[PDB]
Symmetry: D2
Subunit: 315 residues, 4 copies
């Protein structure tokens, strides 16, 4: 069948929500692959029944066999750790996931190269900007066929917090967070709009203040940590963000979505992956949009990339 | 039942598409009211069967009785003429619909006042900015409970044409057209974004030129005329625009949508209706957003309002 | 792009609603082909703008060129007449459309054979059971790649009328109408269920009577005539039925839908098309389900096929 | 705002998926209430961001305060244990949850009575048929305003397994499981249809055998145990089933759905809750449908009710 085959490499919390959303949207057949025995089968069985409630027809299978990557149209990688086994939630940091997740990406890359070299790849494993390039290199896929999750999620948080202060539909607030997904993420105040109107107009009208926005910015950057300390490493929004990206690709929607992508000169950077708006369609990353950042914004972008480069040196 | 009752006053081309979309979206029960005998019943019967295909449960009834407005939660007025009975399609102009549709609005207003004074009203009949105020005055409804169709439709055309040149998802282009729905509509080049990014960046990158944009602007303004000369007064997009507005109201989405609304000082105008972004939610027009227009843009806005004022004088 | 290309051969009332629904559902690119100059372009332009309201990305183009069938994944044929130019609405009969639509099918078949021999074809033009076979023969497509509209529409009417008497969700009533789409359609009382429960149980409980059901049966058979006399040849429900079929094919849903399909022994008939439940998926007509009809029901089926055979003899 | 307020009493695995699906479908505002400190806030925060990806506008709040039940339109109770703290997964049984969950229902009932006596209640906590009546009595709500989850979930499993053997859309298989949700659930072979066609026809055609169906029946009954031993107490399908019920109520769909409801003579039983098809609409349980079971099926139903009665005696 010409229905898309979507392989979720990693069947944990995010993997579970992704499978659920894929069935709700009838996006394609799903394989919940994981290193843990039987669990993926259990989740798959549970999720497969929703086809009835959703009026869909998507097969949902579990797997503990890498070769099931064969024939994959889309591969979503969440495989790895959410935190370092010994740190407290208070000291939670994506950087500490570097020595834990690196070897996993190499292993997965080799299987992708052998089994589904023409698949569209979405990397989620943290530190994402480092992990995505590691997988790009080991999988051998073209630069337009691999992206990392970052901006769609970070901006969803920023967009949401602003929409609640202004009392407008969440999707009506558009915003851009670039550079890298982590504590050095670059929140672009200048590029925020509400109903397509520059945010500064709402600031001028005393509808939202600069002080409130600064607090919203800090909350956005610290959201993962805030949720990690309240409950666990976030998974619902991450899953929804990923599926919006996967959906744009599968349905050729050509949505402008901020993702980690290979930079080849944009922002003065090359040979590294960084967050920037891209257009996702049938041909993968169809366009890499370079925001005409001012020097102050570019300095922040450089600081974000510097972090990715530091961890890429695996130190 | 607490399901919303939506009365479509006018069951012509736009009325037909609206009923179809309401059932697709399961928005509420529908009454296709019209002055023409039996036709509304025929359309209603045809449309009611789609409940099966759509997995919905919306009653769709025809009516030739004004009293069926009783209990209406939303009233959409398309009643009237699409053109003046004697003009050629080449000389098609919304202004000529003034002497034809004025009496119709007064009649409908009286029935709304008597039967459903608490309903949310959406006026479509042209010249819309004039007709909406006429209905506002005769229906007695509060200013936050009545709007006219204009900007959502005009901008859909502008957004679409730009999305095809740039190869991005149509919804990713945001744009604003204000003042009035007609030949004096104000297309705000300064307020156009793509994926939330200022359009000027795409112009700077030679992705779209100023000359191409100027051609797109003219096409947008002349779209109705272009379609009227190819086929008929547009109805599919108008219907979709109206339902997006009605849906924002019914589901309390709080979308920022450009509609004709009573101006009370915005842009230096009062006691007149004009197109401007508003927030539509459960309380109707919850916010009227005034774009901080520059003098050049304001001069264009004044020219648009001048036209509405001229026809309002019924001359 | 791998997005499906859907060619609507005939851009009239049904064609218009189909294009609208395809965009709402983001099913694929649409070509509104017609013999009438410019009209398809006008409708296409109008419909294309809805991509904005619908958050979709489907191209909608008009055409007056048969070669645009090239590359078509799905071809929906509505081309032809809705009534005979001289009969009154009171004497409206699908049989009189035979001498009007036959030549049209042959012409379209030749173009399909040359331009898109691997496309999935849905024939709507009346008398449908005759027209579908005529197109099958002239297009050269495999038997599993062509079907005619009939049962999904006829049953939607029967299902709907019963759901309103019993006060249940319309989709919860399942029913089967077979043989042919026309005055000899076979309404199978024995195969009606409500929430999967045999209808006879509701009849036993005095929730609906046999007399009421008999009236509902007559209304179902005469629905097209009833609407034709109130308004025009039905188009909204027909369009929704067609899209449900096209959607089952495109998304590999494998829905059991009653359509006109080539009979090869089922019900004792061969070399003729007749209405019967089929399973529509990625491989087209994946299964032809033969209802184990009793002799009384089979006698009615024979009467329906007899009519198709009579008109097939073009008399 | 007139948007529905949905209180999820219990914010565990099922609660999490429900909140996610409510936002996807824009069903209403959500309160994730739980006894565990901070966790509901974390899940709510995570889920609230999806409003962006889903184009919805549903508030999602966490709570550790019972009074937040005030103003609730729908209350979904999942509060309790999934297993007895000391049993192995191999010996997992819903009956052992009786001494653990009883006190919880009484406590919740008192709060519902005081805070939202007019809310529609959906009980999920196991053993569900016992728990729902316990909550009915302590909450004081009318019999038409409270139901327990059971049949929609059990049948989703049966419907699914059959659809995969027959290669048809999962929703096209309709089936009925009654009496109680547990090991004594009554699978009604006689009431199974495929595309509305009696299953026996497919058995006659050698498309599926009686032996295969018997294996599918056993798998359906043991599904929860199978998943519990592979992964954990199922939550994705349960959540989807619950939301389909809640949605039928909120949108007045009037779907026929099998749920645990107060029996007042049906099947020869009174003063006890049992699984049976009901019609869920704006007025709650609008109809209780009694299947005209034969003596053999009724004997099985009696065995199911006997179990509920035994545990109701809290022994
Ligand atoms: N890029 C972004 O914006 C975000 C990144 N993340 C990251 O996503 C990753 C996953 O998050 P969760 O799903 O919450 O974690 P989780 O721990 O729930 O799931 C990860 C799964 O990966 C599995 N795994 C380990 N090695 C495997 C391998 N070789 N192949 C397949 N599966 C394997 C584990 O058994 C586990 O089931 C983490 O690194 C997390 O930090 C989380 C949110 C957002
Ligand atoms: N505001 C905007 O953005 C747009 C405005 N329009 C306007 O919408 C109006 C309707 O357009 P269509 O649906 O294409 O026209 P149409 O001619 O197809 O339908 C109008 C219907 O109103 C009926 N009618 C007349 N008096 C009536 C009354 N007293 N009460 C109820 N029904 C009555 C007519 O019988 C007719 O069926 C026109 O004035 C058109 O110019 C069209 C597109 C966009
Ligand atoms: N099978 C079924 O269940 C149903 C069948 N019908 C039939 O569908 C057909 C179409 O119905 P409507 O859309 O309401 O009619 P319509 O008259 O609105 O549209 C038919 C279109 O076909 C065009 N046409 C004629 N020759 C053409 C050709 N060579 N190629 C392409 N286009 C050409 C006409 O110009 C016209 O625009 C009719 O025969 C009608 O009887 C209608 C409802 C249900
Ligand atoms: N009726 C049916 O068809 C099905 C029933 N179930 C039942 O649903 C229940 C919940 O299942 P899961 O969500 O997987 O369990 P879970 O353990 O993940 O979640 C239950 C939550 O209830 C909380 N809780 C305890 N007392 C509370 C109170 N007084 N008020 C509010 N929250 C409180 C717990 O802290 C926990 O977070 C279980 O009894 C399970 O057996 C599960 C599937 C289907």
């Amino acid at each position: 069948a010409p229905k898309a085959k979507i392989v979720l490499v990693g069947s944990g919390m995010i993997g579970g929500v992704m499978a659920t959303l894929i069935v709700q949207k009838n996006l394609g057949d799903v394989v919940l692959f994981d290193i843990v025995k039987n669990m993926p089968h259990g989740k798959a069985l549970d999720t497969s029944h929703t086809n009835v409630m959703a009026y869909s027809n998507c097969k949902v299978s579990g797997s503990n066999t890498y070769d099931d990557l064969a024939g994959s149209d889309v591969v979503i990688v969440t495989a790895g750790f959410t935190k370092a086994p010994g740190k407290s939630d208070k000291e939670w940091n994506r950087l500490d996931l570097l020595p834990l997740n690196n070897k996993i990406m190499i292993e997965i890359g080799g299987h992708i190269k052998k089994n589904c070299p023409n698949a569209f790849i979405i990397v989620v494993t943290n530190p994402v900007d480092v992990m995505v390039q590691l997988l790009h290199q080991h999988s051998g896929v073209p630069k337009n066929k691999i992206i990392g999750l970052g901006g769609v999620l970070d901006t969803s948080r920023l967009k949401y917090y602003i929409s609640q202060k202004l009392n407008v539909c969440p999707r009506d607030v558009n915003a851009h967070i670039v550079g890298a997904h982590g504590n050095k993420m670059v929140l672009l105040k200048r590029y925020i709009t509400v109903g397509g109107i520059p945010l500064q107009e709402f600031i001028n009208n005393k509808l939202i203040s600069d002080a409130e926005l600064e607090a919203i910015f800090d909350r956005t950057v610290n959201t993962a940590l805030e949720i990690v300390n309240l409950h666990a490493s976030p998974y619902v929004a991450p899953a929804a963000a990923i599926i919006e990206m996967a959906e744009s690709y599968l349905k050729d929607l050509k949505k402008v979505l901020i993702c980690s992508t290979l930079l080849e000169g944009q922002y003065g950077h090359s040979d590294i992956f960084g967050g920037t708006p891209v257009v996702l369609g049938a041909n993968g990353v169809e366009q890499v949009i370079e925001l005409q950042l001012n020097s102050e914004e570019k300095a922040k972008f450089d600081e974000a990339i510097a972090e990715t480069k530091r961890m890429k040196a695996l130190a």
